[PDB]
Amino acid sequence: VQIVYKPVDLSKVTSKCGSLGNIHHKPGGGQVEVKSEKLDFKDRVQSKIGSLDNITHVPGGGNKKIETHKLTF
Amino acid sequence: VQIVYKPVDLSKVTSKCGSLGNIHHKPGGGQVEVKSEKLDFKDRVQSKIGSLDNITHVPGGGNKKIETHKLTF
Amino acid sequence: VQIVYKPVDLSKVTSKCGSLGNIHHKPGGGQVEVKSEKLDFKDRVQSKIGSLDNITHVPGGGNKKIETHKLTF
Amino acid sequence: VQIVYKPVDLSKVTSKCGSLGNIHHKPGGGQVEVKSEKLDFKDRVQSKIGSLDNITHVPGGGNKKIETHKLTF
Amino acid sequence: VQIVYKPVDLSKVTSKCGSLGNIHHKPGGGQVEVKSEKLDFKDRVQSKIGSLDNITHVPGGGNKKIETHKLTF
Amino acid sequence: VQIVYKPVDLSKVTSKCGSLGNIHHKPGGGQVEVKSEKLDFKDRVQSKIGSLDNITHVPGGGNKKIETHKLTF
Amino acid sequence: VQIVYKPVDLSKVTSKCGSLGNIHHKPGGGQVEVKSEKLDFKDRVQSKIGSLDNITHVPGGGNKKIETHKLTF
Amino acid sequence: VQIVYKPVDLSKVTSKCGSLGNIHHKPGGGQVEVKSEKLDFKDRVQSKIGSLDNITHVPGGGNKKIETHKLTF
Amino acid sequence: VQIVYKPVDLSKVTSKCGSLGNIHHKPGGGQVEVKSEKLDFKDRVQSKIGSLDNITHVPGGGNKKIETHKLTF
Amino acid sequence: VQIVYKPVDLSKVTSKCGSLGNIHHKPGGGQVEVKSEKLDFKDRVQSKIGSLDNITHVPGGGNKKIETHKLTF
């Protein structure tokens, strides 16, 4: 039995921008209630309860090359 | 049995920007209540309860090459 | 049995920026209540309860090559 | 049985910036209450209860190569 | 049985910045209450209760190569 | 010439209540913009521009006897 | 010429309440902008510009007898 | 010429309350901007610009007899 | 010419309360900006610019008899 | 010419309260900026610029008889 695994990337992920400029983010403040009795979180759980989070995310180039190579015999 | 694993990257992840400039982030303050009796968190849990978090994230290039190589016999 | 594992990176993760400039972050202060009786956190838990956290994160290049190589016989 | 593990990085993680400049961070002070009876934290727990933390994080290049190599026989 | 483990890094983690400049951080003082009866923290616990901590973190290059090599027979 | 002015009030303005009880007032935070050049206010003006005001008004009896007596010769 | 002015009040303005009780007032924080060049306020003006005011007003009897007597010859 | 002015008040302004009780007032913090060049305020002006004021007003009887008697010859 | 001015008050302004009790006032901290060039205030002006004032006002009887008597010949 | 001015008060302004009790006042700290070039305040002016003042005012009877008598020939 023989296996050869040899993938090749010459790939370009690229951007040009003259200026990002006048971004404004101005949210009025909302309201939240959450009510419960019992929570069980039991394997690899991600959770987010009753949050009011505001995000401004303004990268000078935010491109990405998420990648995966897997070999299982 | 023979395995050869030899992947190759000449890959470019890249940006150019003239200026990020006048980002403004001005959130009014909201309101949160969360109510519960019992919480059990029992394997690899991430959690976030009743948070009010504000984020400004303004990188001069925020690009990424998240990557994984795996071989299992 | 023979295994050869020899991956190669000539990879560039890169940025240019002329100036990040006039970032403003000015949040009004919200309000939080969280109520509970009993918390059990029992293996590798991350948790965050009732937090009001504000973040400004403005790196002169925040790019990344998060990476993993694994071999299991 | 034979294993050869010889990964190679010529990898560049890089930035250029002309100036980070006029970052402002001016948060108004919110309000928090958290209420409980009993907390048990029992293996590798991270926790953060009722915090009001403000962060300004402005590195002249904050890029990273978080990395991991693992071999298990 | 034979194992050869010989990973190679010619890797660069790098920055240039012309000047970090006029960072301002001016937080208003919030308010916190936290209430409990009993705390048990019992193996590798981190905790942070009722804190109001303000951080300004402005390094002239804050880049990093967090890394791990592990071999288990 | 003769004038007699002699009005009489035996009037009752009255209330009874067993309890006002569980009033709740929980408004989510709206948003306002107002834009103008020139305002002239020149005799007995009352004005209110761009306000976001919330009121809870819960009197244990809020009845009233607004009244006026006038004689002009 | 003769004028007699002799108005009489035996008037009752009155309340009874068993208890005002569980009033709650919990507004999320909205947002306001107001813009102008020139304001002239020139006789007996009342004004209120861009205000965000919250009021709870809970009197144990808030009744009133606003009144006026006037004679002009 | 003769004037007689002899108004009479036996008037009662009154309340009874068993208890005012559990008033709560918990406002999240909103946000305001006001912009101008020139203000002229020139006779008996009241003004209030860009204010964020919160009021709890809970009198054990707040009733009133605002009153005026005037005679002009 | 003759004037007689002889108004009479037997008036009662009154309250009874069993207890004011558990008033709570817990405001989160909002945010204000006010901008101008020139202010002229020139006769009997009241003004209040950019204020963030919080008030709790809880009198054991706050009733009033604001009153005025005037005679002009 | 004859004037008689003889107003009479048997007036009661009054309260009873059993106990004021558990007043709480717990403000989070907001944030203020005010900007200007030139101020002229020129006759009987009151002003209040950029203040953050918190007040708790809890008198065991705060009732009042603000009053004025005027005679002008």
PDB file of N, CA, C and O in Angstrom, chain A residues 36-41, chain B residues 35-42 49, chain C residues 35-42, chain D residues 38:
ATOM      1  N   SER A  36     -35.796  31.695  33.605  1.00  0.00           N
ATOM      2  CA  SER A  36     -35.613  30.244  33.529  1.00  0.00           C
ATOM      3  C   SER A  36     -35.564  29.632  34.930  1.00  0.00           C
ATOM      4  O   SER A  36     -35.532  30.346  35.930  1.00  0.00           O
ATOM      5  N   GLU A  37     -35.604  28.305  35.026  1.00  0.00           N
ATOM      6  CA  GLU A  37     -35.347  27.601  36.284  1.00  0.00           C
ATOM      7  C   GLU A  37     -33.959  26.947  36.270  1.00  0.00           C
ATOM      8  O   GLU A  37     -33.079  27.351  37.028  1.00  0.00           O
ATOM      9  N   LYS A  38     -33.728  25.976  35.385  1.00  0.00           N
ATOM     10  CA  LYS A  38     -32.550  25.104  35.424  1.00  0.00           C
ATOM     11  C   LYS A  38     -31.878  24.996  34.059  1.00  0.00           C
ATOM     12  O   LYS A  38     -32.557  24.685  33.081  1.00  0.00           O
ATOM     13  N   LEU A  39     -30.559  25.185  33.993  1.00  0.00           N
ATOM     14  CA  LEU A  39     -29.746  24.979  32.787  1.00  0.00           C
ATOM     15  C   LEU A  39     -28.707  23.867  32.994  1.00  0.00           C
ATOM     16  O   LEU A  39     -27.873  23.981  33.885  1.00  0.00           O
ATOM     17  N   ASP A  40     -28.694  22.838  32.142  1.00  0.00           N
ATOM     18  CA  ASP A  40     -27.599  21.859  32.071  1.00  0.00           C
ATOM     19  C   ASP A  40     -26.890  21.966  30.718  1.00  0.00           C
ATOM     20  O   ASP A  40     -27.489  21.665  29.686  1.00  0.00           O
ATOM     21  N   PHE A  41     -25.609  22.326  30.697  1.00  0.00           N
ATOM     22  CA  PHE A  41     -24.775  22.337  29.491  1.00  0.00           C
ATOM     23  C   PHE A  41     -23.670  21.282  29.637  1.00  0.00           C
ATOM     24  O   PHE A  41     -22.884  21.349  30.580  1.00  0.00           O
TER      25      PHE A  41
ATOM     26  N   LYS B  35     -32.803  35.904  35.080  1.00  0.00           N
ATOM     27  CA  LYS B  35     -33.230  35.234  36.320  1.00  0.00           C
ATOM     28  C   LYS B  35     -33.262  33.725  36.142  1.00  0.00           C
ATOM     29  O   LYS B  35     -33.687  33.233  35.104  1.00  0.00           O
ATOM     30  N   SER B  36     -32.820  32.997  37.158  1.00  0.00           N
ATOM     31  CA  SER B  36     -32.564  31.554  37.109  1.00  0.00           C
ATOM     32  C   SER B  36     -32.583  30.953  38.517  1.00  0.00           C
ATOM     33  O   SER B  36     -32.551  31.688  39.503  1.00  0.00           O
ATOM     34  N   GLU B  37     -32.623  29.629  38.644  1.00  0.00           N
ATOM     35  CA  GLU B  37     -32.341  28.939  39.905  1.00  0.00           C
ATOM     36  C   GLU B  37     -30.972  28.252  39.849  1.00  0.00           C
ATOM     37  O   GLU B  37     -30.073  28.627  40.599  1.00  0.00           O
ATOM     38  N   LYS B  38     -30.781  27.269  38.964  1.00  0.00           N
ATOM     39  CA  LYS B  38     -29.627  26.361  39.026  1.00  0.00           C
ATOM     40  C   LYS B  38     -28.929  26.208  37.679  1.00  0.00           C
ATOM     41  O   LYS B  38     -29.584  25.889  36.690  1.00  0.00           O
ATOM     42  N   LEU B  39     -27.606  26.377  37.639  1.00  0.00           N
ATOM     43  CA  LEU B  39     -26.795  26.177  36.435  1.00  0.00           C
ATOM     44  C   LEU B  39     -25.770  25.048  36.645  1.00  0.00           C
ATOM     45  O   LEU B  39     -24.932  25.163  37.533  1.00  0.00           O
ATOM     46  N   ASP B  40     -25.765  24.007  35.811  1.00  0.00           N
ATOM     47  CA  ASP B  40     -24.690  23.005  35.760  1.00  0.00           C
ATOM     48  C   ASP B  40     -23.970  23.058  34.407  1.00  0.00           C
ATOM     49  O   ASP B  40     -24.549  22.704  33.382  1.00  0.00           O
ATOM     50  N   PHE B  41     -22.688  23.412  34.386  1.00  0.00           N
ATOM     51  CA  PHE B  41     -21.868  23.407  33.172  1.00  0.00           C
ATOM     52  C   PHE B  41     -20.766  22.349  33.318  1.00  0.00           C
ATOM     53  O   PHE B  41     -19.965  22.429  34.247  1.00  0.00           O
ATOM     54  N   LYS B  42     -20.722  21.332  32.449  1.00  0.00           N
ATOM     55  CA  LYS B  42     -20.098  20.037  32.804  1.00  0.00           C
ATOM     56  C   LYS B  42     -19.046  19.457  31.853  1.00  0.00           C
ATOM     57  O   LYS B  42     -18.384  18.509  32.261  1.00  0.00           O
ATOM     58  N   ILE B  49     -23.675  35.321  30.149  1.00  0.00           N
ATOM     59  CA  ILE B  49     -25.022  35.555  30.688  1.00  0.00           C
ATOM     60  C   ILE B  49     -25.203  37.025  31.036  1.00  0.00           C
ATOM     61  O   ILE B  49     -24.456  37.571  31.836  1.00  0.00           O
TER      62      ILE B  49
ATOM     63  N   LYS C  35     -29.659  37.077  38.440  1.00  0.00           N
ATOM     64  CA  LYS C  35     -30.108  36.410  39.671  1.00  0.00           C
ATOM     65  C   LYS C  35     -30.136  34.897  39.509  1.00  0.00           C
ATOM     66  O   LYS C  35     -30.489  34.372  38.454  1.00  0.00           O
ATOM     67  N   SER C  36     -29.736  34.197  40.560  1.00  0.00           N
ATOM     68  CA  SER C  36     -29.492  32.752  40.576  1.00  0.00           C
ATOM     69  C   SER C  36     -29.561  32.214  42.007  1.00  0.00           C
ATOM     70  O   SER C  36     -29.546  32.986  42.964  1.00  0.00           O
ATOM     71  N   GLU C  37     -29.617  30.897  42.178  1.00  0.00           N
ATOM     72  CA  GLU C  37     -29.350  30.242  43.458  1.00  0.00           C
ATOM     73  C   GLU C  37     -27.989  29.538  43.419  1.00  0.00           C
ATOM     74  O   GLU C  37     -27.087  29.913  44.165  1.00  0.00           O
ATOM     75  N   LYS C  38     -27.810  28.539  42.549  1.00  0.00           N
ATOM     76  CA  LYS C  38     -26.670  27.616  42.626  1.00  0.00           C
ATOM     77  C   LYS C  38     -25.972  27.435  41.283  1.00  0.00           C
ATOM     78  O   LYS C  38     -26.631  27.124  40.293  1.00  0.00           O
ATOM     79  N   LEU C  39     -24.647  27.576  41.251  1.00  0.00           N
ATOM     80  CA  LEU C  39     -23.826  27.350  40.058  1.00  0.00           C
ATOM     81  C   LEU C  39     -22.834  26.197  40.290  1.00  0.00           C
ATOM     82  O   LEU C  39     -22.006  26.299  41.189  1.00  0.00           O
ATOM     83  N   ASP C  40     -22.843  25.148  39.464  1.00  0.00           N
ATOM     84  CA  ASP C  40     -21.780  24.131  39.428  1.00  0.00           C
ATOM     85  C   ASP C  40     -21.058  24.156  38.076  1.00  0.00           C
ATOM     86  O   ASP C  40     -21.636  23.780  37.057  1.00  0.00           O
ATOM     87  N   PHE C  41     -19.775  24.505  38.049  1.00  0.00           N
ATOM     88  CA  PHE C  41     -18.958  24.476  36.833  1.00  0.00           C
ATOM     89  C   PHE C  41     -17.863  23.415  36.996  1.00  0.00           C
ATOM     90  O   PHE C  41     -17.061  23.507  37.925  1.00  0.00           O
ATOM     91  N   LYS C  42     -17.822  22.384  36.143  1.00  0.00           N
ATOM     92  CA  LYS C  42     -17.208  21.092  36.522  1.00  0.00           C
ATOM     93  C   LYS C  42     -16.156  20.482  35.587  1.00  0.00           C
ATOM     94  O   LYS C  42     -15.504  19.538  36.020  1.00  0.00           O
TER      95      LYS C  42
ATOM     96  N   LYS D  38     -24.837  29.829  46.132  1.00  0.00           N
ATOM     97  CA  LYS D  38     -23.707  28.896  46.227  1.00  0.00           C
ATOM     98  C   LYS D  38     -23.005  28.690  44.889  1.00  0.00           C
ATOM     99  O   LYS D  38     -23.664  28.383  43.898  1.00  0.00           O
TER     100      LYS D  38
END
